[PDB]
Subunit: 241 residues, 3 copies
């Protein structure tokens, strides 16, 4: 029957021992000066409730049922300063306090591993209006576009997130998220006009007066108005974007 | 005096042993291939510094002083895709990448357990303008209202949070958070007018001209103006909301 | 050669034992009713993969390579209600559900320890328009200013973050982030006018008519217009901020 020594009252040990681990069936306390640690492991293999340190991702992880080796404690924000460099490259789960006082800097998103992989940046100097920041998604696309994206808003802060490859990167958490006037004096009596870029909504002024909603229809980047206007007429148009 | 065997130089063990736990008073290292794990426990009972895995909430938790069994590592974001379904039900601490390309989908917030319980959603397809999303709070109320709430903004992302039952759910973290023109030609000489919904602020135009702030007062969904206006007068009103 | 007892088949122990720790080289399972725990430690000294509980910060921490003793699981949000008090003081990593129904309350940011140190607040009652909240940064400055900051927006929620001492505190995560009309009838024929505060952009109306972009230039808090206007002229100016 019994296969191995048993110690009714347990026992004591006054030096570091060497085990091939075990199954605990009771309570694991500590005394002062006691230390603890995790296996420095790197594999993709594991089983739920199993836990490790990682000496590459410098991140205390735990194997979850759906997925496996997530960061322990869920999602989290690694707040570090970034010393201004023309180009910088950013690591998942880290958030960067950017300075653009020097001038315009760039940052390159990492290659996404898992969905959720989440990076964060913050205009902590409020310099982005004066000296913008651009965001290189690398091979993988951002909001569908492989093309980079620029940031122009003093004081802004954004969390980027991998959504899968079609839409690629997107913004999840964040903080901090165009007055056209075409005017001229009709050389002739004219029934239509074309604005330099399509406006969403527009206000029209004919001489002094504010023209009525009925007097025109607006479509794309052109404005018809019945009745057609006479020559010598100062018309103001306020393209809204 | 002594009650149990003592091992001056500690010892060695080349197989998995079986303990009723203990109190460590020194350093707990590991060698390569070493593994670690947590008790698969489910109770509400525990004591600070005590820690576990949970085989229901699939979440590495730790008993804190104020509260008890929180998720270890504080609050975190479980980023998963959601395959479009007319109805879906959402789990705390998880964040969902929603698609509404198919059409309009719905999601039901879980029953809140603790205050803080925090869910997150994201229009990762930018389809919410074209095909909105609605948010069922279930029995418990949202911002005071038991009534559901709809979302209409292309590209949006929101973190919901339980605040307690009076106000119920609210939005904490998030990203991405109405041109009325009444016009007519006064049949008669008229001293007042009623707008179809109360405007907050309004611009008034009488014939061509932009009427002065003194000429009217505005209240609720009606506009008085002294002096009272004459008949045959084209007046434009720009309800702002 | 051998220095300490070895137990080929490992062994068993039916009571809590007392160790000076060890190096595990195998697998550390558990049985039902098994418990676990961390050393209640307080020092700044430690080595990566080492982990502890803290009986002051009531926070399960782990020593990371760059930095040392971070909270395990990265950044996280400690959601608690705050019972309205004229003054309250706030702890890092905690997020407060504020009520200002009573009246105007204040909150004092803690002294920042590490960069990243991140506090969060939320107008969960939507009372901030009616009864504002103010934010004392203490000695350390907020966005450069040592001067406090007030909050006026019903429904808002903000994450504060320590960036370093020059800019001090800033806002990273968050949710929820001025109609001047000067009018008069020119006593005389006047070529310039001064607005009570500099406007960014402005709309000008002369009698009824909306004046053209060419007719004036705007600078600081003054408006020139060529040609200079005649006396008896009702002019409206819409300061935009």
């Amino acid at each position: 029957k019994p296969t191995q020594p048993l110690f009714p009252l347990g026992l004591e040990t006054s030096e570091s021992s060497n085990i091939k681990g075990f199954n605990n069936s009771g309570t694991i306390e500590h005394s002062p000066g006691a230390v603890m640690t995790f296996p420095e492991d790197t594999e993709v293999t594991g089983l739920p409730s199993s836990v490790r340190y990682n000496p590459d991702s410098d991140e205390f992880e735990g194997y979850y049922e759906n997925g496996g080796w997530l960061s322990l404690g869920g999602g989290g924000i690694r707040w570090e300063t970034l010393p201004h460099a023309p180009s910088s490259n950013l690591l998942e789960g880290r958030g960067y306090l950017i300075n653009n006082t020097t001038g315009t800097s760039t940052v390159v998103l990492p290659s996404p591993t898992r969905i959720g992989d989440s990076v964060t940046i913050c205009d902590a100097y409020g310099k982005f209006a004066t000296y913008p920041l651009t965001v290189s998604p690398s091979g993988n696309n951002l909001y569908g576009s492989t093309e980079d994206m620029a940031i122009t808003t003093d004081n802004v802060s954004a969390t980027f997130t991998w959504s899968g490859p079609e839409q690629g990167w997107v913004i999840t958490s964040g903080v901090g998220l165009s007055r056209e006037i075409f005017t001229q004096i009709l050389a002739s009596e004219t029934s239509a006009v074309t604005l330099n870029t399509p406006p969403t909504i527009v206000d029209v002024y004919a001489d002094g007066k504010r023209l009525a909603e009925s007097k025109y229809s607006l479509d794309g980047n052109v404005i018809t108005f019945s009745p057609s206007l006479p020559a010598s007429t100062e018309l103001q148009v306020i393209e809204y974007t």
